[PDB]
């Protein structure tokens, strides 16, 4: 059985997701259009910038996050934003088409659509391999959300100052996930282990993106196309 | 008569305008859409940001500007960008509708469309009065372009270091304008004087916009909607 408190964490983490993810992708029309030089760069920056806004809404609703100091919240966020984005992006990734399908044919993002925004297959290849490996796991909603909140609360990120408290927080969430799979997932298996394997991949994808972002952000004709939010989060200050 | 050199300045200043102003307003579709909270703020920031890019293209083509030092070019630009923008905006301002008409009905910018982007009638009132006062003058192309290049080369802006050279430049351009009106404008009249009157207005409109921009740029939920270029030009660094 799960304790009353562990089901409250599950209740409130699932609801936080539903408030911050729109299965209709309707706000995509408010972005700058995509063009198919780095022609896809405006529209993706607007897209990621919007997602950062949603990750911050989700994070404000993880039990315990609201109570860390302001510096710790920012350091966690700056270091894990790109990985949470890769995680929530799994919900729109279709196994067929091998593309992110956000509704219409303009928001179908093949791998060629991403290269026209400054990235190379040295990142896109492991990214897509990550997206099918996650898709084949067939996670429940409650598992997907737990995975996100755990990746956020990792202590081993640059800039944290209260490891003991954020690690205590992360460990309470591992416990809830393990308990969920035991009681509520059939056969049990090593789902928990394949899930924790996926965390170690995001560390490697994080690093690649940050290298390629640095090259883009040094070229003033490309940083000009970013949003203020993107520059604040993926910058070093 | 005008000397061979004064007609070269007129030739090359008119061509610079034609390269940097699109009477079709076709690139407006690449911006973020307008919405009618400050709902018009995305689309206008994208709009002004695009115009700053065109003012820099024009300025690089004024005889003598390319030869000032890099610091002087930037100081001139930072201080006069908003006024050149107000000047080139006259070309799309219709006397009827009392709005800027950039083609379709989405790019008709009444005065209400601008208030939904953070500005008040304490700036919009003298702005529209400026736009009809300029419209009624019925300037030739060669006069409109000269007016812009003169307003750019004023020495009395914060940050200039070589007044004597940029004033020598500005004075050569006043001479060309006076000569143009004598030879090429009918009756002569005090057109030159009403034109120089319009410069003194832009100084007053400049100040109002910069006050209201400062209030907007201090609110982080509104600076988030600006572009990097706008933040770099209207910031103080």
């Amino acid at each position: 059985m799960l304790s009353d408190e562990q089901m409250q964490i599950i209740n409130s983490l699932v609801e936080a997701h539903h408030k911050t993810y729109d299965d209709s992708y309707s706000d995509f029309v408010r972005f700058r259009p995509p063009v198919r030089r780095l022609s896809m760069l405006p529209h993706l920056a607007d897209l990621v910038s919007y997602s950062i806004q949603k990750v911050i809404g989700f994070a404000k609703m993880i039990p315990g996050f609201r109570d860390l100091t302001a510096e710790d919240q920012i350091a966690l966020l700056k270091s894990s934003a790109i990985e949470i984005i890769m995680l929530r992006s799994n919900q729109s990734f279709s196994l067929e088409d091998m593309s992110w399908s956000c509704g219409g044919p303009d928001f179908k993002y093949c791998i060629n659509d991403v290269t026209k925004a400054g990235h190379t297959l040295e990142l896109l290849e492991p990214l897509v391999k990550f997206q099918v490996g996650l898709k084949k796991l067939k996670l429940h909603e409650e598992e997907h959300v737990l995975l996100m909140a755990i990746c956020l609360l990792s202590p081993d990120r640059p800039g944290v100052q209260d490891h003991v408290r954020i690690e205590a927080l992360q460990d309470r969430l591992c416990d809830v996930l393990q308990a969920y799979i035991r009681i509520q997932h059939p056969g049990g298996r090593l789902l928990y282990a394949k899930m924790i394997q996926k965390l170690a991949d995001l560390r490697s994808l994080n690093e690649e993106h940050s290298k390629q972002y640095r090259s883009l952000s040094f070229q003033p004709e490309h940083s000009m196309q970013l949003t203020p939010l993107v520059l604040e989060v993926f910058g070093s200050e | 008569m005008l000397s061979d050199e004064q007609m070269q300045i007129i030739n090359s200043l008119v061509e610079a305008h034609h390269k940097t102003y699109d009477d079709s307003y076709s690139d407006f579709v690449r911006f973020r859409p307008p919405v009618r909270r400050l709902s018009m703020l995305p689309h206008l920031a994208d709009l002004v940001s695009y115009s700053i890019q065109k003012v820099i293209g024009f300025a690089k083509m004024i005889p003598g500007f390319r030869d000032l030092t890099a610091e002087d070019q930037i100081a001139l630009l930072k201080s006069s960008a908003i006024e050149i923008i107000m000047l080139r905006s006259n070309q799309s301002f219709s006397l009827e509708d009392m709005s800027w008409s950039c083609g379709g009905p989405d790019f008709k910018y009444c005065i209400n469309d601008v208030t939904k982007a953070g500005h008040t009638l304490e700036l919009l009132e003298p702005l529209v009065k400026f736009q009809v006062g300029l419209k009624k003058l019925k300037l030739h192309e060669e006069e409109h372009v000269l007016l812009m290049a003169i307003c750019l080369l004023s020495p009395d802006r914060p940050g200039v270091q070589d007044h004597v050279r940029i004033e020598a430049l500005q004075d050569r351009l006043c001479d060309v304008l006076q000569a143009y009106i004598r030879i090429q404008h009918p009756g002569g009249r005090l057109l030159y004087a009403k034109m120089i009157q319009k410069l003194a207005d832009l100084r007053s409109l400049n100040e109002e916009h910069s006050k209201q921009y400062r209030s907007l740029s201090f609110q982080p939920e509104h600076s988030m909607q600006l572009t990097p270029l706008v933040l770099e030009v209207f910031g103080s660094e």
Partner: peptide
Amino acid sequence: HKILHRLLQ
């Protein structure tokens, strides 16, 4: 840090 602080309410 400006935008993130305000966003973090």
